[PDB]
PDB file of C-alpha atoms and ligand atoms in Angstrom:
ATOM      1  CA  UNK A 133     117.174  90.879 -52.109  1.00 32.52           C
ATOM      2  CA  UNK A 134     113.929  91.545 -53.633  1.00 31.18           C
ATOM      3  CA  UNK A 135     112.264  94.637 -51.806  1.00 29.74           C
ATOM      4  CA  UNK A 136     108.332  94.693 -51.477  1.00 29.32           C
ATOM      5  CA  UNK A 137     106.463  98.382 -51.887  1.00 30.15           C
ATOM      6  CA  UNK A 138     103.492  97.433 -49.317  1.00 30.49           C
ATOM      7  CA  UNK A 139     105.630  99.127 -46.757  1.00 30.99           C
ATOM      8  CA  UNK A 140     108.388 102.125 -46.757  1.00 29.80           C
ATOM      9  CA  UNK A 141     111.761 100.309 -48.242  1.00 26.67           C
ATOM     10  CA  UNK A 142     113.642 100.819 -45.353  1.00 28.68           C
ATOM     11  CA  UNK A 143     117.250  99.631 -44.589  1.00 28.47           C
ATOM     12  CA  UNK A 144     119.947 100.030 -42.131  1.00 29.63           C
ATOM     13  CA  UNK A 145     123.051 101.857 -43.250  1.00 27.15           C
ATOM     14  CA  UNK A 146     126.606 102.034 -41.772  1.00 26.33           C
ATOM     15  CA  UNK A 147     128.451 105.437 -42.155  1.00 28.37           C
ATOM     16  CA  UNK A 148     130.771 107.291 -40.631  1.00 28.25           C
ATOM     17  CA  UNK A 149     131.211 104.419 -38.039  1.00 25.74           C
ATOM     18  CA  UNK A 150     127.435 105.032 -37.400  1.00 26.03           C
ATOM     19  CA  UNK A 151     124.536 102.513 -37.803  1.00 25.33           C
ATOM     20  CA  UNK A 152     121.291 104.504 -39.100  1.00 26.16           C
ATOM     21  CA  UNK A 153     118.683 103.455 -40.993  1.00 27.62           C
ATOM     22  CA  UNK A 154     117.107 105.021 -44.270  1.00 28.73           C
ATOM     23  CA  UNK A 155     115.208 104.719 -47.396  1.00 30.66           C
ATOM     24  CA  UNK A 156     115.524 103.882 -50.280  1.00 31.52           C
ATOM     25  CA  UNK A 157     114.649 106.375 -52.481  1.00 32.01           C
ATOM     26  CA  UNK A 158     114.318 105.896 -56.704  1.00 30.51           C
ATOM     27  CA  UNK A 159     113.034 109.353 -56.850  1.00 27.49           C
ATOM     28  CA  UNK A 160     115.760 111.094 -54.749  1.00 27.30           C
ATOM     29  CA  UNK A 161     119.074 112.615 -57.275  1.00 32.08           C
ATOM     30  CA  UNK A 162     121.293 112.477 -54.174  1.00 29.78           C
ATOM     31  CA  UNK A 163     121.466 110.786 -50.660  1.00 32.53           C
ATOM     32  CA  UNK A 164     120.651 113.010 -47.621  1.00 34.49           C
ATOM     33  CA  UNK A 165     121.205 112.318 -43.939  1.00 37.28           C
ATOM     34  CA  UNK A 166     120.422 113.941 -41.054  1.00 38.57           C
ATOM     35  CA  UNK A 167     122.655 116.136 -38.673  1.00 37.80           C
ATOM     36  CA  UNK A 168     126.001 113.788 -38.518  1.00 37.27           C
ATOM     37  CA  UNK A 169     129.508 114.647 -38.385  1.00 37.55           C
ATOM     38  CA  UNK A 170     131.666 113.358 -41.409  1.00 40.09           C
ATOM     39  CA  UNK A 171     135.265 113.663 -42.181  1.00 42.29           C
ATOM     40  CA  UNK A 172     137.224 116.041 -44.628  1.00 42.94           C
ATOM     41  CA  UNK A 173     136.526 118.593 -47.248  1.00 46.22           C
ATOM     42  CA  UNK A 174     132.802 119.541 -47.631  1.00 45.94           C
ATOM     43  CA  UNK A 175     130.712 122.972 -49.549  1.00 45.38           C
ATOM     44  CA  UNK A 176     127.347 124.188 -48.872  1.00 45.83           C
ATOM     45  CA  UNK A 177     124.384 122.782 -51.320  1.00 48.92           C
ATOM     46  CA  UNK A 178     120.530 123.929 -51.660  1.00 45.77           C
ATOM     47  CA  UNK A 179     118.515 120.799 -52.428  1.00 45.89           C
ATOM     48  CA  UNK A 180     114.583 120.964 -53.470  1.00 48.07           C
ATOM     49  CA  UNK A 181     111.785 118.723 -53.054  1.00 44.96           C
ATOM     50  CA  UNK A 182     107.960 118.944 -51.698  1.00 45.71           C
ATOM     51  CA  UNK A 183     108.340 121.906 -49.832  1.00 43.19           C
ATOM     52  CA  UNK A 184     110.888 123.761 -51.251  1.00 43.75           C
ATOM     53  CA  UNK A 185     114.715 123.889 -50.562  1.00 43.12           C
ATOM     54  CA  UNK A 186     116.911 123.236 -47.311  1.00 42.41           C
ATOM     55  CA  UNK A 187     121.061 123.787 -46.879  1.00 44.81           C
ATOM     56  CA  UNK A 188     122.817 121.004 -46.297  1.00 45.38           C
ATOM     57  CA  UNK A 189     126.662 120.299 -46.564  1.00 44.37           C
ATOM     58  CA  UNK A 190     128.263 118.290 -49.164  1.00 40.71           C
ATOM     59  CA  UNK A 191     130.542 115.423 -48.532  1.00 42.77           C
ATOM     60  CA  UNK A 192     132.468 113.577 -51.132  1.00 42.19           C
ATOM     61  CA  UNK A 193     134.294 110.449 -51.638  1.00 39.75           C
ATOM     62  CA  UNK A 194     132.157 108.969 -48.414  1.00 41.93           C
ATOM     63  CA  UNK A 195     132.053 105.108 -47.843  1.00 41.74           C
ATOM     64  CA  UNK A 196     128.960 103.528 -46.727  1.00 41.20           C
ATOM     65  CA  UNK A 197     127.519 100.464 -46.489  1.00 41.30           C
ATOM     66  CA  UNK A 198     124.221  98.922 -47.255  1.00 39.72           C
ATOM     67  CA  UNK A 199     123.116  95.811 -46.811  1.00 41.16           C
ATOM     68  CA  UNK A 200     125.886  94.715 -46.527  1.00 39.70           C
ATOM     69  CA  UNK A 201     126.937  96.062 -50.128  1.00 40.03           C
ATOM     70  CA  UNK A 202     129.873  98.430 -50.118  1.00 41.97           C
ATOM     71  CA  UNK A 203     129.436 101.960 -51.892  1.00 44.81           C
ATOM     72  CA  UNK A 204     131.535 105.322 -51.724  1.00 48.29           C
ATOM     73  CA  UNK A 205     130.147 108.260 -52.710  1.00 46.82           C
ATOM     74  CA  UNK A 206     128.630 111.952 -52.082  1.00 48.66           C
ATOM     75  CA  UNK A 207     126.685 111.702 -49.139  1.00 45.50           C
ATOM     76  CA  UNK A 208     124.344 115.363 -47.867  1.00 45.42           C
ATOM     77  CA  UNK A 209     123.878 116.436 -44.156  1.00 45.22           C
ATOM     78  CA  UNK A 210     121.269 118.852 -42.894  1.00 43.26           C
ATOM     79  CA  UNK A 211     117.605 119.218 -41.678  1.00 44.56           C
ATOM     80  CA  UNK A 212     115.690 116.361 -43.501  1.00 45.99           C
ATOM     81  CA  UNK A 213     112.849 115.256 -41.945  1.00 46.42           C
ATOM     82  CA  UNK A 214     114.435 111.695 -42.985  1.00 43.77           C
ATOM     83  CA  UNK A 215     117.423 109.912 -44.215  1.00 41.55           C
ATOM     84  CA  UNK A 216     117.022 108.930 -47.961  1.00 39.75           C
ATOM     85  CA  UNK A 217     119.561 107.027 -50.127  1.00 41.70           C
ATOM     86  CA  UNK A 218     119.393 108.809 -53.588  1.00 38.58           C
ATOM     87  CA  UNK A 219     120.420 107.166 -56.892  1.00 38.81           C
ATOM     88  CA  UNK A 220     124.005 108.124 -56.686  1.00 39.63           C
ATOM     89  CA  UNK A 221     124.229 105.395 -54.044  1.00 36.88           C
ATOM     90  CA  UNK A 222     121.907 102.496 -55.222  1.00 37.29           C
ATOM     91  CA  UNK A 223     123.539 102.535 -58.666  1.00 36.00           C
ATOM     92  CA  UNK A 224     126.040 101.092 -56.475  1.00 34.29           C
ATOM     93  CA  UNK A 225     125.021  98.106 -55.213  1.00 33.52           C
ATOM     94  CA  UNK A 226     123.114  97.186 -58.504  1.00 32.55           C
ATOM     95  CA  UNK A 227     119.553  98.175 -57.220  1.00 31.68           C
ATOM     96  CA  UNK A 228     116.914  98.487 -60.417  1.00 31.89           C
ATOM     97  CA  UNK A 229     113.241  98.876 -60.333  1.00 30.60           C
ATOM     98  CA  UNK A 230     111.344  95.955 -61.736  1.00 28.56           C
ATOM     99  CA  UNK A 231     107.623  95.263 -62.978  1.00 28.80           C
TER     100      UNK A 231
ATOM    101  CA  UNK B 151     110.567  96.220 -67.230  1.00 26.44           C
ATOM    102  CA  UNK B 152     113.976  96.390 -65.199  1.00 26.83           C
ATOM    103  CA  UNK B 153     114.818 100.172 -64.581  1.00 23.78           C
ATOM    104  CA  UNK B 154     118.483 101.181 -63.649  1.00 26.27           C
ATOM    105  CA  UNK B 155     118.905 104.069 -62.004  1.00 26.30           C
ATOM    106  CA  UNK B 156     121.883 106.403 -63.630  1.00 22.14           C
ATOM    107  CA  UNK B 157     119.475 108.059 -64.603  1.00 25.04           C
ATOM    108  CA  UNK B 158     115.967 109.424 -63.575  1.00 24.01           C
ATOM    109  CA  UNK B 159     113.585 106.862 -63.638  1.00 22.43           C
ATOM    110  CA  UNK B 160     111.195 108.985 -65.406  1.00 24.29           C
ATOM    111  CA  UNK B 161     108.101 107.261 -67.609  1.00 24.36           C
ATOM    112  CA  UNK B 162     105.175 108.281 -69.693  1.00 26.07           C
ATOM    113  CA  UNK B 163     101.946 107.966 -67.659  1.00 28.91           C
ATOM    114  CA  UNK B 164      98.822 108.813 -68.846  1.00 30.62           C
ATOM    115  CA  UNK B 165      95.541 110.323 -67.212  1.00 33.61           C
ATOM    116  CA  UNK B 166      92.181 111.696 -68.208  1.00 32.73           C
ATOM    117  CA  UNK B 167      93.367 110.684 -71.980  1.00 32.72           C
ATOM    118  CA  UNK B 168      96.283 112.766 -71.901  1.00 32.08           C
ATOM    119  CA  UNK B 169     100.115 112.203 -71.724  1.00 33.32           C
ATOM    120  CA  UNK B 170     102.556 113.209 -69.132  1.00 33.84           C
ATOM    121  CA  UNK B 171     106.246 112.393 -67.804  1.00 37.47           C
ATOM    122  CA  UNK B 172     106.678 111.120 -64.112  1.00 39.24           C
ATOM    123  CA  UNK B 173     109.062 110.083 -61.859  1.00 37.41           C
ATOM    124  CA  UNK B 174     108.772 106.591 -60.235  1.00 38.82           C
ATOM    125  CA  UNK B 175     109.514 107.234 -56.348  1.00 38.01           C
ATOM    126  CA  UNK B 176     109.615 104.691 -53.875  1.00 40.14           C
ATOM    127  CA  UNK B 177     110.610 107.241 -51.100  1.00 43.36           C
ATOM    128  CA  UNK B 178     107.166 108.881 -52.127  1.00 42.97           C
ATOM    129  CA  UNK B 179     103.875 107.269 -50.028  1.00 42.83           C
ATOM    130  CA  UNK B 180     101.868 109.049 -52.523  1.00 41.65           C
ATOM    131  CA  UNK B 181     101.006 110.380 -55.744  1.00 41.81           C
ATOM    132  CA  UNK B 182     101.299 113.500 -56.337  1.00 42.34           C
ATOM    133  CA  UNK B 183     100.778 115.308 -59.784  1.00 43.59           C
ATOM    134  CA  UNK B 184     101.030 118.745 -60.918  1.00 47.56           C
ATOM    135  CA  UNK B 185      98.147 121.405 -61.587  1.00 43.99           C
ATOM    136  CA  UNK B 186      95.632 119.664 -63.215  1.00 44.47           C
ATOM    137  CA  UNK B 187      91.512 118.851 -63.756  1.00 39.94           C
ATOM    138  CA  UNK B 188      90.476 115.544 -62.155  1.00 40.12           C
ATOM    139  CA  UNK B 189      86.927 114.542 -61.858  1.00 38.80           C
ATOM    140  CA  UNK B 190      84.666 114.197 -58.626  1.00 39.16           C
ATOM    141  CA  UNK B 191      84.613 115.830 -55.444  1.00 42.57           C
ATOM    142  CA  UNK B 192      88.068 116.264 -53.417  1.00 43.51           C
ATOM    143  CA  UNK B 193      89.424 115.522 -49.729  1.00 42.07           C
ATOM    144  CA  UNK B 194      91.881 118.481 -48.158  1.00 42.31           C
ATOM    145  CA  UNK B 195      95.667 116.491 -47.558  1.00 41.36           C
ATOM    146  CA  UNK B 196      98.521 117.702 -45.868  1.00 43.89           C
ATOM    147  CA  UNK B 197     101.802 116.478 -47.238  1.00 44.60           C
ATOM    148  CA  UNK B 198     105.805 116.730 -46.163  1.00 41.66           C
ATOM    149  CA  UNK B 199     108.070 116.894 -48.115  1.00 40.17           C
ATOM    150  CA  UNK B 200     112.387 117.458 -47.707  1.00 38.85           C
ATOM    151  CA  UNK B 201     111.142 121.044 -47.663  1.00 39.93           C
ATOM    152  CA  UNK B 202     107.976 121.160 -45.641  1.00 41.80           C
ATOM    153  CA  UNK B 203     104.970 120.430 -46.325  1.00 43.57           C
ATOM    154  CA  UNK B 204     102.229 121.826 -49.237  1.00 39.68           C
ATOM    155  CA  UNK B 205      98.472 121.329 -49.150  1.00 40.08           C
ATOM    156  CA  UNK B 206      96.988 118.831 -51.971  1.00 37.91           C
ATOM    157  CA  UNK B 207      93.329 117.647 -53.513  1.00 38.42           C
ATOM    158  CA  UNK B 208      93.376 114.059 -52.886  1.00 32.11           C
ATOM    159  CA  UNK B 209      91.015 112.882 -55.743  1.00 32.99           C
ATOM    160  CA  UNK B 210      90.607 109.034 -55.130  1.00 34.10           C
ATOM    161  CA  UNK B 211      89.435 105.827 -57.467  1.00 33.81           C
ATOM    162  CA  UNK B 212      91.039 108.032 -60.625  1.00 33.34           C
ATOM    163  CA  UNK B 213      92.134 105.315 -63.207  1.00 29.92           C
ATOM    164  CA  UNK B 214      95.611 105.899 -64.526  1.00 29.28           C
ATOM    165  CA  UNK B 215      98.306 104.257 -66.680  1.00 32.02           C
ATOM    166  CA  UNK B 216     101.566 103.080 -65.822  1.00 32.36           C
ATOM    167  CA  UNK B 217     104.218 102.080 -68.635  1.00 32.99           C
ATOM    168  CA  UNK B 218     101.206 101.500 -69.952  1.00 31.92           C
ATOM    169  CA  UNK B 219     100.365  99.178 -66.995  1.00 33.25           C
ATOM    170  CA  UNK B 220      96.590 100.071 -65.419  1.00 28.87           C
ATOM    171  CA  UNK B 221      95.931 101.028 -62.187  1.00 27.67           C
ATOM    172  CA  UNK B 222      92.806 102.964 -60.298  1.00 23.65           C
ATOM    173  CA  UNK B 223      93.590 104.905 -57.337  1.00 20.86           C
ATOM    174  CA  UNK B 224      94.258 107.704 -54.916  1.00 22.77           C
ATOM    175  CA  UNK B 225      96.320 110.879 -57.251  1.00 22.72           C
ATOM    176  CA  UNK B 226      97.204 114.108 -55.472  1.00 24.76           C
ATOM    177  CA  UNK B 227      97.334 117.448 -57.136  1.00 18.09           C
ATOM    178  CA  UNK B 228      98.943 119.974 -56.316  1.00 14.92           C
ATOM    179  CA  UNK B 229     102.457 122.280 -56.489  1.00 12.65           C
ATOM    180  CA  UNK B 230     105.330 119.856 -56.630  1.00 11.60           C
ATOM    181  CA  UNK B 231     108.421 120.062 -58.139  1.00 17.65           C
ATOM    182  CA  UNK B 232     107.745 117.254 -60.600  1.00 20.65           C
ATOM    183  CA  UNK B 233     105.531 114.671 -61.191  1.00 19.45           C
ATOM    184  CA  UNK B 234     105.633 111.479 -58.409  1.00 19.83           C
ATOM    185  CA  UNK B 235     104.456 108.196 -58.743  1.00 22.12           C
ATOM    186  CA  UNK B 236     104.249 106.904 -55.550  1.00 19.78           C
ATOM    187  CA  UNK B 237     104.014 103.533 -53.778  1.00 21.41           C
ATOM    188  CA  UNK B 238     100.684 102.997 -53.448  1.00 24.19           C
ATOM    189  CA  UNK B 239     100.344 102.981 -57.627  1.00 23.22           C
ATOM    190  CA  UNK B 240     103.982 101.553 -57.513  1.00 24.92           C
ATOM    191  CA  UNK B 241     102.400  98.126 -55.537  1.00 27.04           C
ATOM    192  CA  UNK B 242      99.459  98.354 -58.092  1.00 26.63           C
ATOM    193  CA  UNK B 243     101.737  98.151 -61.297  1.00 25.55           C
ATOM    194  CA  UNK B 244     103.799  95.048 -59.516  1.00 27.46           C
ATOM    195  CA  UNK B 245     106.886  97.402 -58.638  1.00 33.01           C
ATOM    196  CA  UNK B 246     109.914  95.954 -57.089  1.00 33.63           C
ATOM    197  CA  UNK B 247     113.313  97.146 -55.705  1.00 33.46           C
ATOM    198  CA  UNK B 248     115.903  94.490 -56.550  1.00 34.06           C
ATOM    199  CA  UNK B 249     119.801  94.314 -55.918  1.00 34.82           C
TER     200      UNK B 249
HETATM  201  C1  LIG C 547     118.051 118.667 -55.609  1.00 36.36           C
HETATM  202  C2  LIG C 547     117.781 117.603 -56.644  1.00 36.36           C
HETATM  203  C3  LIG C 547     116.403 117.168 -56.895  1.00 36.36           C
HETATM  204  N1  LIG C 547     115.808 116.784 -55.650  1.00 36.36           N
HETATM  205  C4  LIG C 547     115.789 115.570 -55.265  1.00 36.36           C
HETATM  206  O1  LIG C 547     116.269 114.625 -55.931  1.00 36.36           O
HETATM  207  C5  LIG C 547     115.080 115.322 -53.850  1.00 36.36           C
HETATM  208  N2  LIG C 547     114.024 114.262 -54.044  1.00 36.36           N
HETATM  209  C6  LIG C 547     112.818 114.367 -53.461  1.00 36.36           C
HETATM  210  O2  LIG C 547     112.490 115.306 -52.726  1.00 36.36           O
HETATM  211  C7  LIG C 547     111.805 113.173 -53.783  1.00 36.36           C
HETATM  212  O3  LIG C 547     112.528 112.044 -54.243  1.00 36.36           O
HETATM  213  C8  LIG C 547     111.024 112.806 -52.563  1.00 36.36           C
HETATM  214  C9  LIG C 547     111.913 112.205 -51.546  1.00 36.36           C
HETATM  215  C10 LIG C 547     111.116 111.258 -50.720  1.00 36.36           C
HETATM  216  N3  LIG C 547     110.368 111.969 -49.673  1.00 36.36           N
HETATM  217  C11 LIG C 547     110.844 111.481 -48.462  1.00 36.36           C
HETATM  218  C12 LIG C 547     110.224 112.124 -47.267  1.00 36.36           C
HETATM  219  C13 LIG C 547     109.375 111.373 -46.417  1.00 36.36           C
HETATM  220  C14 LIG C 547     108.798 111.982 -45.289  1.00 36.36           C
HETATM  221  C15 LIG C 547     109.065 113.322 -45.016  1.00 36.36           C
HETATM  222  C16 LIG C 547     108.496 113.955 -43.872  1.00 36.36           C
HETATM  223  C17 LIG C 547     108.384 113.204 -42.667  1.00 36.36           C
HETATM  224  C18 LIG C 547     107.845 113.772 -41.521  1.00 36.36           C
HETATM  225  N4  LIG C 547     107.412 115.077 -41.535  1.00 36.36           N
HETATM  226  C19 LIG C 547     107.518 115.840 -42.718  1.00 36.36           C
HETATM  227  C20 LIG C 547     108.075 115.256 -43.900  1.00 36.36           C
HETATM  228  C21 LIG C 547     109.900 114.040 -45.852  1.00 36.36           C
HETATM  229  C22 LIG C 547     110.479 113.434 -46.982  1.00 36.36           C
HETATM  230  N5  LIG C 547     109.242 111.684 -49.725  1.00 36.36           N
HETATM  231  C23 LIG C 547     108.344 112.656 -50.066  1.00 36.36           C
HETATM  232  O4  LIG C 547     108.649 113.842 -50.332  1.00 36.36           O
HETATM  233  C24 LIG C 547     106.883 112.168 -50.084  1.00 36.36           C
HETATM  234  N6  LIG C 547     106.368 112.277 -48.719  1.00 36.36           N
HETATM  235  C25 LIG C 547     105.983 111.245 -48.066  1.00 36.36           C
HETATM  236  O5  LIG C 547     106.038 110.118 -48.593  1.00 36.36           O
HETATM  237  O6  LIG C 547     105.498 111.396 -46.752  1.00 36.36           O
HETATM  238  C26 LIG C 547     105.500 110.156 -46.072  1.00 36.36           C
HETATM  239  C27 LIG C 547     105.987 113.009 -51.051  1.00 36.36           C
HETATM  240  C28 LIG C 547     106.623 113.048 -52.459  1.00 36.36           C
HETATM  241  C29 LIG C 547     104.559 112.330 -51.136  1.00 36.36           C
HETATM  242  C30 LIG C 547     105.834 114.461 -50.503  1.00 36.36           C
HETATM  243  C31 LIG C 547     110.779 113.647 -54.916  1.00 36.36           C
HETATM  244  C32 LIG C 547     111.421 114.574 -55.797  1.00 36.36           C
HETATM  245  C33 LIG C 547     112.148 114.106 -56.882  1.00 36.36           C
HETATM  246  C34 LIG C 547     112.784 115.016 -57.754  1.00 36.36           C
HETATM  247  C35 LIG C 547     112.679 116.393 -57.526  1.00 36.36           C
HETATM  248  C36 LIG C 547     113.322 117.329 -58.407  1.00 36.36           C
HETATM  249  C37 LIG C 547     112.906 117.086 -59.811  1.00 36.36           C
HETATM  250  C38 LIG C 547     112.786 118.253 -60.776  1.00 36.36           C
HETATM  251  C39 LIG C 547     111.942 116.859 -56.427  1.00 36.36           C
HETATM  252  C40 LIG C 547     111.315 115.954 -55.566  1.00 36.36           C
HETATM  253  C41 LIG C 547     116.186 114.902 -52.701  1.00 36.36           C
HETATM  254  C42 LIG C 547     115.532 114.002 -51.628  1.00 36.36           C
HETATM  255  C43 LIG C 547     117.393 114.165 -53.352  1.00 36.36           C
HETATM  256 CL1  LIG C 548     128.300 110.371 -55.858  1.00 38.30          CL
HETATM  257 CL1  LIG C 549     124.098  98.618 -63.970  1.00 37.50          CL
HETATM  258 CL1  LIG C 550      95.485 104.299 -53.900  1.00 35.39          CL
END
């Protein structure tokens, strides 16, 4: 699709047998969800922004889906104020910024 | 231009005749620079981040280029991390999320 910028570039997600929605995020390194459960191995991260830092733990090897484009990858779970796919996701699914 | 996103999608903007780097955010409502001097009188914002949330100047109708693309508007200044171009010069430059 082509995404519009007039509004927050929201989508819905499907993870961990979960439907959530989140946005998309060009400026974001990684992808961060909030409070979730999630299978297998995971280590403890400190991830900045506006604000300053906040734990979360690290999942790897994660599938998701969105819009209907499959993805694995590293997915982060802790106390954002909102779900954000990061780069390391929409690389994935061929997303680019265009003007 | 078409962006990918591998890596940062960061881009030389300029602003009161001078250079700088930023990062073009589309998880970002606003934008927010670092430390600098703007012209005019200011308005007090409040703004959240993954971290919290920091106090700004919002300086408004402050013309600023793009990727060398032109736009006037609303810049925040204040202590972030980096940098942010958000959407509201992101719809202004013709800006696009495509997959
Ligand atoms: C650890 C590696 C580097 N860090 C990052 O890559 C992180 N990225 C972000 O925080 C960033 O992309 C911003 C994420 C989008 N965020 C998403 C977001 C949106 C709302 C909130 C929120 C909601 C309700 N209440 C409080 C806060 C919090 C985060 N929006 C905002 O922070 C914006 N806020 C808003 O737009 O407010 C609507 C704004 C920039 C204007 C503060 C901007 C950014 C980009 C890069 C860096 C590091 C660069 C040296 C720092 C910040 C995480 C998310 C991956
Ligand atoms: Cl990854
Ligand atoms: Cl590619
Ligand atoms: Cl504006």
């Amino acid at each position: 699709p082509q995404i519009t910028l007039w509004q927050r570039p929201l989508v819905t997600i499907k993870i961990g047998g979960q439907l959530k929605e989140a946005l998309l995020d060009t400026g974001a390194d990684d992808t961060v969800l909030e409070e979730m459960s999630l299978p297998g191995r995971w280590k403890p991260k400190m991830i900045g922004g506006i604000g300053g830092f906040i734990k979360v733990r690290q999942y790897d090897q994660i599938p998701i889906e969105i819009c209907g484009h499959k993805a694995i990858g590293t997915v982060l779970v802790g106390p954002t104020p909102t779900n954000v796919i990061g780069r390391n996701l929409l690389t994935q699914i061929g997303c680019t910024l265009n003007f």
